[PDB]
Amino acid sequence: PVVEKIAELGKYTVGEGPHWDHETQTLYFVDTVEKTFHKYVPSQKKYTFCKVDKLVSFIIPLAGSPGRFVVSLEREIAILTWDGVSAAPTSIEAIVNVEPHIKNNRLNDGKADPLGNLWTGTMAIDAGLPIGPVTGSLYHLGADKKVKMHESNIAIANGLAWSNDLKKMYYIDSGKRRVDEYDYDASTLSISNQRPLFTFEKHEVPGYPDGQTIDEEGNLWVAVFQGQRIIKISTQQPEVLLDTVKIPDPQVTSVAFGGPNLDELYVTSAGLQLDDSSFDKSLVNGHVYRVTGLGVKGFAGVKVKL
Ligand SMILES: [Hg+2]
Ligand SMILES: [Hg+2]
Ligand SMILES: [Hg+2]
Ligand SMILES: [Mg+2]
Known part of the structure; x- marks a missing residue:
């Protein structure tokens, strides 16, 4: 297998929640701790991000509804409406608080x-x-x-x-x-x-x-x-x-198949230094990686249906 660091993307505190949307050939992911969502379009080398003021942990396109995403905001599941490029969402509509x-x-x-x-x-x-x-x-x-x-x-x-x-x-x-x-x-x-x-x-x-x-x-x-x-x-x-x-x-931290043939594995990681780490700080960076040559294909990310 070949592992490459995706230089275009920088370092994340806790990169997580990768999701590959096959129809738009776009990878979405989050940084939990930094309260940001991220979008990367590999074929055009486009990267954007979006800031909120709650802890976030996933981002999934809403079925049938371009420009809307189902996300977590601390304990709330919410619909974010986002143009995919501006640094803040257009609107946020909470669906349910799972543990009020x-x-x-x-x-x-x-x-x-x-x-x-x-x-x-x-x-x-x-x-x-x-x-x-x-x-x-x-x-x-x-x-x-x-x-x-x-x-x-x-x-x-x-x-x-x-x-x-x-x-x-x-x-x-x-x-x-x-x-x-x-x-x-x-x-x-x-x-x-x-x-x-x-x-x-x-x-x-x-x-x-x-x-x-x-x-x-x-x-x-x-x-x-x-x-x-x-x-x-x-x-x-x-x-x-x-x-x-x-x-x-x-x-x-996590993994998702992506790429045009669903045979590239995108991998997120965390740069946050924890106590009792088995690794020195200079090694803990939080890059995003792509792994190719695994010999298998996966599936595209499934949208949430409400
Ligand atoms: Hg975003
Ligand atoms: Hg957003
Ligand atoms: Hg935004
Ligand atoms: Mg996780």
Whole structure:
């Protein structure tokens, strides 16, 4: 595989939430801590950003509605209307606050399932690794624009993916240092039968799982925060490590397939220095990377349907 640093993009405090819109060949992503959204159009070398005054953790185009995006603003799920280039949104319309009385929580990773439903989970704003408060839950946003809860006691609500046959959902609580698998019922949007798919400790994989995505062959690509890598793992059988790709930045946070043929992997990372880092500060930068030559394709990002 070839790993390239995307020079055009600079350094992010906590780059996260990459989303590839295939119809416009555009990558969107966030910096959680700096309260900014980012847009990159690789074919034209265009980069823009947009500032808000709440912590943000994902940005997904709204189905059927050009120029509108579903985003997180601390604990609110909101529709942002944005021209893709001005430094502030045109307007913000809140949809729902998922946890109105839990003042010290925030939303973290979120993604649409293959049907267009937004799934996303919460966590303490001061969550910590490897130990910290455990106050998060996992939700989806339903038809009556109210949330349904699917899991609780989550420390660090992170990456989501769904199997290509819509039978399984994969989920990461970074605090557990493992990837879980659930049976997923597409009819009722219910998950059940939680079991560990991949346990870091059994494979001497350092760091913590963070974001993840799935490829056309059904394998998972998982970002390893404080592991300086992405790993490829099987979904056909538990506890199988298929490949490792080293990424120069130690704090890799998430991954999305993109490019015209959906065979380039975009990788975000975090430059924020944490206490108890296993890496010296000079190494922790927060660049965005592109990985090519993996031999597989993924899928385009799914828009949220409301
Ligand atoms: Hg923006
Ligand atoms: Hg924006
Ligand atoms: Hg904006
Ligand atoms: Mg994450």
